[PDB]
Amino acid sequence: HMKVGILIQARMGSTRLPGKIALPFGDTTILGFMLERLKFSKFQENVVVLTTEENIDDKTEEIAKKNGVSVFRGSANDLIQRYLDAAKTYNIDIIVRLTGDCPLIDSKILDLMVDLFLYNQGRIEFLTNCFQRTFARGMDIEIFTLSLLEKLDSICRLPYEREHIVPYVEENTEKFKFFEYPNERDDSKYRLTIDTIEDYETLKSCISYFLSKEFSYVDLIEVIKKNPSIIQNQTIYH
Ligand SMILES: [Cl-]
Ligand SMILES: [Mg+2]
DSSP states (O other), X not given: OOOEEEEEEOOTTOSSSTTGGGSEXXXXXXXXXXXXHHTTSTTGGGEEEEEESSGGGHXXXXXXXXXXXXXXXXXXXXXXXXXXXXXXXXXXXXXEEEETTOTTOOHHHHHHHHHHHHHTBTTBXXXXXXXXXXXXXXXXXXXEEHHHHHHHHHHOOSHHHHHHSSHHHHHTGGGSOEEEOOOSSOOTTOBOSOSSHHHHHHHHHHHTTOSSSOOOHHHHHHHHHHOGGGOOSSOOOO
């Protein structure tokens, strides 16, 4: 009965490293690489890129269209409104919130988290793997109901809350049907999001050890563990 949507927020004018989603990455762009990885999700048919109406994000729309996913163009700084508009537009009941600085997101982890959410319908309204952090940065996945998002839209007036969506949930967990999803070990010391040039260099080194874009998260950590010099956004100690 429930429609799951993977709603990826991305924009060219990002606060950190503006333009990064359009950087060359493998045979595509940073954002295009992410979309190709999400094509392997069992929920791939309802992927939408949520970006702004500013002219610069014609590039974001272009990248999404090249990858055959839908595009929603809305509020630049009110992400609650952008996600609520998109979810209503596409009749989404369960929102999988991703951001375009996570190009190596693993669709198998996403699918497991959605499966857990759906199996507990009515006992969970918010599932995250990035409150407590045991995955590398850049695997961040948050899942919540349209109903929860509507409660946040009604409750939250602060600009920080409107821009980041989840902060009120994270600081008031006992007010929600809140649950967390762990990694099997603590990989939080690894940073696999793109906010700096050093992140980019690290991520470029990562994908060079795999022949396709279908590699899993655990494959990636094992390659980093075997080739510690992949990590260029953090000092390496032997
Ligand atoms: Cl954005
Ligand atoms: Mg980010």
